[PDB]
Amino acid sequence: QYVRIKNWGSGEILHDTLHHKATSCLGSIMNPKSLTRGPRDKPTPLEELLPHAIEFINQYYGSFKEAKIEEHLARLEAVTKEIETTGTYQLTLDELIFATKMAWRNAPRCIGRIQWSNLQVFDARNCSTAQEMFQHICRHILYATNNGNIRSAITVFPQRSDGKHDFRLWNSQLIRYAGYQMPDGTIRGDAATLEFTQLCIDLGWKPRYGRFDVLPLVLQADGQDPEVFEIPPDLVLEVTMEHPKYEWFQELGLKWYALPAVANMLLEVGGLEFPACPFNGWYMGTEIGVRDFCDTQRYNILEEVGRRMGLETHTLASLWKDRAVTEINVAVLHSFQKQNVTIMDHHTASESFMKHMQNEYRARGGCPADWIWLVPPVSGSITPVFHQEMLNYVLSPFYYYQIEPWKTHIWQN
Amino acid sequence: QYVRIKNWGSGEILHDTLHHKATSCLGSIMNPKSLTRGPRDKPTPLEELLPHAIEFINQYYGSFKEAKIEEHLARLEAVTKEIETTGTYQLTLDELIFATKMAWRNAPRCIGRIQWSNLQVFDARNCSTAQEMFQHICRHILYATNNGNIRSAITVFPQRSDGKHDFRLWNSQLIRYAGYQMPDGTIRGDAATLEFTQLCIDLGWKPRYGRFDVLPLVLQADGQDPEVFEIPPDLVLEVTMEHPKYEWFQELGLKWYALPAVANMLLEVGGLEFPACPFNGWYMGTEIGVRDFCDTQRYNILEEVGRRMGLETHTLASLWKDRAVTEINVAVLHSFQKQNVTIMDHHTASESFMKHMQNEYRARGGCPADWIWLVPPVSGSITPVFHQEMLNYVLSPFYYYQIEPWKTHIWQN
Numbered sequence: 025q026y027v028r029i030k031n032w033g034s035g036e037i038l039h040d041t042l043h044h045k046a047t048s049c050l051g052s053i054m055n056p057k058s059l060t061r062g063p064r065d066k067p068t069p070l071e072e073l074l075p076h077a078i079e080f081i082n083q084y085y086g087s088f089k090e091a092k093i094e095e096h097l098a099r100l101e102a103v104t105k106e107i108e109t110t111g112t113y114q115l116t117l118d119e120l121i122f123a124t125k126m127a128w129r130n131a132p133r134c135i136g137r138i139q140w141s142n143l144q145v146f147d148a149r150n151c152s153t154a155q156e157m158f159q160h161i162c163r164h165i166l167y168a169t170n171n172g173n174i175r176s177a178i179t180v181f182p183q184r185s186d187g188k189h190d191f192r193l194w195n196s197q198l199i200r201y202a203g204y205q206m207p208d209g210t211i212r213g214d215a216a217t218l219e220f221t222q223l224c225i226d227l228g229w230k231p232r233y234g235r236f237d238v239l240p241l242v243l244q245a246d247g248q249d250p251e252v253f254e255i256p257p258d259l260v261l262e263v264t265m266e267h268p269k270y271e272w273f274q275e276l277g278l279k280w281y282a283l284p285a286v287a288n289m290l291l292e293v294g295g296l297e298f299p300a301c302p303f304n305g306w307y308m309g310t311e312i313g314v315r316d317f318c319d320t321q322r323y324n325i326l327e328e329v330g331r332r333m334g335l336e337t338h339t340l341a342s343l344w345k346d347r348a349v350t351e352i353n354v355a356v357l358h359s360f361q362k363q364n365v366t367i368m369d370h371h372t373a374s375e376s377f378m379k380h381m382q383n384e385y386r387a388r389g390g391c392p393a394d395w396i397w398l399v400p401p402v403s404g405s406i407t408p409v410f411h412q413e414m415l416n417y418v419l420s421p422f423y424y425y426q427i428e429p430w431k432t433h434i435w436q437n
Numbered sequence: 438q439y440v441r442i443k444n445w446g447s448g449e450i451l452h453d454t455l456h457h458k459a460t461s462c463l464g465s466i467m468n469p470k471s472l473t474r475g476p477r478d479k480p481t482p483l484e485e486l487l488p489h490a491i492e493f494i495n496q497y498y499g500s501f502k503e504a505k506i507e508e509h510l511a512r513l514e515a516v517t518k519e520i521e522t523t524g525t526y527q528l529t530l531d532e533l534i535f536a537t538k539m540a541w542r543n544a545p546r547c548i549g550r551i552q553w554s555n556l557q558v559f560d561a562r563n564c565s566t567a568q569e570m571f572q573h574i575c576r577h578i579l580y581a582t583n584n585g586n587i588r589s590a591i592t593v594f595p596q597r598s599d600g601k602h603d604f605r606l607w608n609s610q611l612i613r614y615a616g617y618q619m620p621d622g623t624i625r626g627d628a629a630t631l632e633f634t635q636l637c638i639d640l641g642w643k644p645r646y647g648r649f650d651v652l653p654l655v656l657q658a659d660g661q662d663p664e665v666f667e668i669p670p671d672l673v674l675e676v677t678m679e680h681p682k683y684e685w686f687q688e689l690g691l692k693w694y695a696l697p698a699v700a701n702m703l704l705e706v707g708g709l710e711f712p713a714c715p716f717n718g719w720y721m722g723t724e725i726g727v728r729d730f731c732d733t734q735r736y737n738i739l740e741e742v743g744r745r746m747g748l749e750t751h752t753l754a755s756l757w758k759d760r761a762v763t764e765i766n767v768a769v770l771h772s773f774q775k776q777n778v779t780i781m782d783h784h785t786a787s788e789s790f791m792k793h794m795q796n797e798y799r800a801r802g803g804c805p806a807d808w809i810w811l812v813p814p815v816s817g818s819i820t821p822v823f824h825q826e827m828l829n830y831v832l833s834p835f836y837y838y839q840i841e842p843w844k845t846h847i848w849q850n
């Protein structure tokens with residue numbers, strides 16, 4: 025049958041049948057095992073790889089408007105033989121392109137999925153060295169950035185073979201700031217990247233002890249020890265934070281990178297695994313203004329901006345935190361828009377996702393969604409998405425989390 | 438063992454062992470069967486009632502600091518015999534008081550649980566007629582209201598016997614406004630109570646076609662047809678909405694009842710079920726300002742307040758919805774505080790719940806929590822609760838939802 029889903033805002037009902045294809049209640053758990061695809065030391069068993077491969081080949085060929093059975097049956101034949109003769113198989117570029125968009129399409133934590141069909145794919149499956157990973161990463165950052173007119177892209181490195189030759193990016197994001205535990209008890213920069221910053225120092229990276237120090241790319245190639253590479257500052261576009269009214273906002277000396285790029289996820293498709301496949305899209309205002317700037321475990325600027333606004337920062341009931349965070353979000357949006365850097369505010373994003381959800385239900389009878397992540401960190405019920413009942417499930421292709429590399433890596437030297 | 442829970446704000450770790458006592462992923466489903474205890478036509482089977490009764494008696498007696506084994510063993514004896522001789526059993530007043538607070542304690546959707554130990558219990562288990570239910574309900578509303586100094590209370594009516602004599606309140610809340618489908622296409626009042634308002638009209642209630650018409654109590658006594666009773670206006674305390682700066686706010690002619698009282702839930706305890714046990718606490722600002730006033734399926738005042746604030750109400754990116762909703766929340770809080778009606782803002786509530794959670798983990802190794810409901814409808818990440826990982830589970834005693842009565846009732850006449 026199906027599962028009835030209701031939108032309490034519009035009163036609309038949808039019928040979810042897509043969940044039938046997935047694979048006590050841990051609700052708000054950030055990194056659950058169900059969303060994580062770990063390491064291996066031995067190749068994927070053939071009895072598992074084959075049915076998974078076949079299923080993907082059928083999905084891929086079954087995605088065209090006008091079916092191409094001749095080519096479909098031929099691919100099934102060749103794939104089976106390649107697995108038989110080599111122990112694994114290589115996807116064609118079109119299958120990879122299809123796989124990367126589908127995985128994005130299947131990302132339950134992404135509110136920007138209406139753009140799923142627009143994705144640039146850089147094939148780095150022939151990559152061999154750390155230096156080469158680095159060159160691809162630079163080409164990626166440069167293409168995606170496009171001088172502010174952000175373009176969604178993904179770079180695919182070699183697939184996992186036996187699990188002892190994994191290509192991995194130790195960074196959580198391509199571009200991110202360093203976090204320092206200054207002497208005076210106060211953390212400087214981005215407190216989220218504290219443990220990682222130290223790791224970069226252990227590998228010889230030169231600390232510049234600032235609030236916005238762009239960290240280096242830490243690349244692991246073919247299972248070998250990671251190599252440190254600084255990102256050419258020319259490639260890192262940034263936005264100066266300016267409020268369109270409180271001229272004292274600049275006096276805060278705030279800024280943020282224009283490129284949100286995930287660096288540590290794993291792409292699973294047709295039984296294959298890609299431990300390294302960095303991808304980016306464009307920012308949604310609240311990520312920066314609310315999470316990056318106001319989380320107490322991040323920049324924690326909230327009170328400083330409060331005091332500055334001349335608000336009762338000692339009486340919670342005054343709703344000062346509410347007033348401040350809104351101006352910061354206004355600052356962020358204002359700044360990006362002025363400096364011509366692509367950005368989407370949370371209200372527009374939500375409406376866009378609601379539209380995407382409607383489309384997906386008619387198109388394939390469902391849309392895997394994680395309410396907890398899809399609802400903006402501010403203006404909850406003020407957004408459409410808040411009133412939309414959702415079903416969270418893992419399909420395939422899919423983007424999985426991975427165990428942090430420093431926790432499983434065997435240091436050669 | 439246990440489940441590790443992490444607060445990403447403070448970095449604190451907690452160990453949940455309490456879940457061991459409970460009983461694809463439907464995350465954002467509002468009324469799931471797991472939270473609903475439906476009707477019956479036959480009495481609870483003895484093989485089920487007894488172990489459930491015994492478990493509760495053991496929990497109750499095992500709750501005291503200094504154990505009272507003599508009385509504990511005697512109660513087990515008497516309970517067993519009462520079930521043997523009568524087919525069911527009556528809780529003592531102390532057990533009921535304990536049960537109602539524990540059920541509240543176990544309510545995963547309640548952010549106000551730090552107050553669990555402060556609950557007035559009105560024993561109406563001897564109630565017989567609709568008129569009597571009504572008198573108890575009036576006594577409740579009056580006690581709880583206390584001229585604005587709100588007091589948490591619950592009234593327990595007779596327990597379900599065979600399921601064909603259920604005491605039920607057809608209302609969702611004790612005090613609520615009517616919703617009318619005016620001629621000109623526009624809904625008037627509270628659109629949420631549309632279907633119910635009609636039901637009240639079918640039962641003879643006199644429509645007053647206003648925006649704030651307090652609906653009547655629809656009481657079902659001893660399984661019989663429901664009787665309509667208007668609530669004495671003297672008992673219904675209200676708050677006039679006034680902004681401390683935008684004097685034009687009053688020109689909106691808004692107000693809200695000071696008493697949030699759930700009327701349709703079922704209390705389950707020791708194998709017994711109470712289909713009628715209305716309860717109240719005090720309001721949290723956002724319930725009114727954000728949900729009641731701004732939900733499009735409710736009052737939907739957002740744009741009108743936007744225009745009035747002289748904001749760009751046609752450009753989402755301007756974040757006008759953000760600016761407006763904050764003033765409304767300021768209005769609500771301001772008004773209640775002035776007219777001396779108890780109220781809690783969402784930031785204070787969240788901090789209070791976080792404190793309660795800490796206490797509960799040390800006290801009993803867990804706190805059943807539903808993130809989706811505990812995180813305020815605005816200022817999501819700005820609150821502590823947003824960064825707290827939570828585990829949602831059903832314990833016992835517990836407050837369950839029930840199937841709407843008009844859907845299962847057999848109309849005698």
Ligand code: HEM
Pocket residue numbers: 124128131133134135136137139143176177178286303304305306307308311368423
């Ligand atoms: C085109 C613009 C896009 C927008 C506006 C967008 C927006 C978002 C937002 C707001 C989040 C949550 C951020 C957080 O709280 O960490 C997110 C997460 C995610 N998005 Fe998108 N995204 C876009 C493109 C993409 C692309 C191109 C991919 C993949 C190819 C993608 C994959 C995902 C995944 C897997 C997550 C989850 C990351 C995690 O769990 O930490 N997104 N996206």
Ligand code: HEM
Pocket residue numbers: 537541544546547548549550552556589590591699716717718719720721724781836
């Ligand atoms: C003392 C003050 C209290 C506060 C501030 C408080 C606050 C809240 C809030 C904000 C909600 C969610 C409202 C909604 O979105 O519908 C709620 C739900 C709930 N609360 Fe409390 N509450 C209080 C007392 C109580 C008491 C005395 C009980 C029970 C004896 C209780 C039982 C629950 C239950 C069962 C729900 C869920 C109702 C539903 O699922 O629709 N609360 N409470």
Ligand SMILES: C[C@H](O)[C@H](O)[C@H]1CNc2nc(N)[nH]c(=O)c2N1
Pocket residue numbers: 052053054396397398445823824825826827
């Ligand atoms: C504990 C909770 O899961 C965590 O704080 C969340 C919740 N929702 C989120 N939503 C988004 N989009 N991004 C996040 O990082 C989080 N974190």
Ligand SMILES: C[C@H](O)[C@H](O)[C@H]1CNc2nc(N)[nH]c(=O)c2N1
Pocket residue numbers: 032410411412413414465466467809810811
């Ligand atoms: C679909 C979703 O479950 C629904 O809109 C929610 C979510 N969170 C909520 N949270 C609270 N406190 N109250 C609610 O009514 C809801 N409704």
Ligand SMILES: CCCc1cc(C)cc(N)n1
Pocket residue numbers: 197284285286303304305306307308311
């Ligand atoms: C890097 C932070 C998380 C993220 C990822 C993507 C793809 C888009 C986006 N806007 N944010």
Ligand SMILES: CCCc1cc(C)cc(N)n1
Pocket residue numbers: 610697698699716717718719720721724
């Ligand atoms: C009646 C609306 C829901 C509710 C219930 C309780 C007990 C408290 C509260 N503040 N809100």
